[PDB]
Amino acid sequence: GDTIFGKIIRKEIPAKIIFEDDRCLAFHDISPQAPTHFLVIPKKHISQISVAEDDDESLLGHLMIVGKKCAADLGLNKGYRMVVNEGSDGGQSVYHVNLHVLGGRQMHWPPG
Amino acid sequence: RPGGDTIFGKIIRKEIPAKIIFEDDRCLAFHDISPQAPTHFLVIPKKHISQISVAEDDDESLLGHLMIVGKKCAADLGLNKGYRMVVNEGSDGGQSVYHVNLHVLGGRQMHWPPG
Numbered sequence: 266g267d268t269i270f271g272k273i274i275r276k277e278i279p280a281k282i283i284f285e286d287d288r289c290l291a292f293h294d295i296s297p298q299a300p301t302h303f304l305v306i307p308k309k310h311i312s313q314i315s316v317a318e319d320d321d322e323s324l325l326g327h328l329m330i331v332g333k334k335c336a337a338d339l340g341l342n343k344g345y346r347m348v349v350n351e352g353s354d355g356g357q358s359v360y361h362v363n364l365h366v367l368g369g370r371q372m373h374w375p376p377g
Numbered sequence: 378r379p380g381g382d383t384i385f386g387k388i389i390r391k392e393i394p395a396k397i398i399f400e401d402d403r404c405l406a407f408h409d410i411s412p413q414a415p416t417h418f419l420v421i422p423k424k425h426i427s428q429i430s431v432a433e434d435d436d437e438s439l440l441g442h443l444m445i446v447g448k449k450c451a452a453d454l455g456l457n458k459g460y461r462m463v464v465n466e467g468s469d470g471g472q473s474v475y476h477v478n479l480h481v482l483g484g485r486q487m488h489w490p491p492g
């Protein structure tokens with residue numbers, strides 16, 4: 266089923282977009298948990314990482330490379346944390362694969 | 378040496394023991410020595426990359442492979458209620474071993490924010 270991230274990709278509702286290409290979108294999280302907190306999502310609707318296919322490998326890696334480049338562009342030179350949540354225990358809030366990138370503060374351990 | 382001389386390079390070359398879950402030509406999955414959840418393991422590339430901020434464009438497939446292997450291992454380990462994947466970059470990220478590593482944590486409710 267469609268999600269709010271689908272609406273964002275289709276530009277039906279606003280988001281603060283950081284980067285776009287033909288296969289992904291990066292935008293600031295509406296509920297930021299760090300001074301910088303954005304998401305990188307594929308345009309392909311993969312509901313969750315547990316159902317990602319083998320053929321999706323380089324696309325998932327693309328999310329991480331885009332995330333790393335956006336983090337550098339946003340000035341996160343002291344570092345950052347990347348997170349993917351799966352399901353209930355993972356605290357996944359939207360069933361559209363999304364890579365969190367958080368920084369601008371010390372991230373702590375355990376990671377939730 | 379292939380893998381570098383971080384603790385993870387030693388583990389890749391079987392010079393230091395680890396509890397291995399999965400191994401192929403591109404990566405290694407093994408349990409974390411200081412688990413932060415009832416199940417907590419790591420997926421690392423065999424190719425040494427110090428941190429995600431210096432990964433090359435051509436590392437895309439490899440990085441994605443870490444996640445695919447991570448999700449497959451999580452299923453094999455019975456993490457049916459879900460899990461969290463984490464990559465830490467640098468000081469603010471809390472990185473402690475400068476060899477790229479993906480954490481997979483499950484077997485309990487993970488909380489928000491993720492640290």
Ligand SMILES: CCNP(=O)(O)OC[C@H]1O[C@@H](n2cnc3c(=O)nc(N)[nH]c32)[C@H](O)[C@@H]1O
Binds near residue numbers: 396407410412474475
């Ligand atoms: C926040 C932790 N820093 P990181 O660089 O993101 O992750 C490094 C992880 O490697 C783990 N570590 C560090 N040393 C070892 C080890 O010798 N054997 C195993 N199996 N794991 C080991 C450590 O507990 C930590 O969670």
Ligand SMILES: [Cl-]
Binds near residue numbers: 350356357359363
């Ligand atoms: Cl989520």
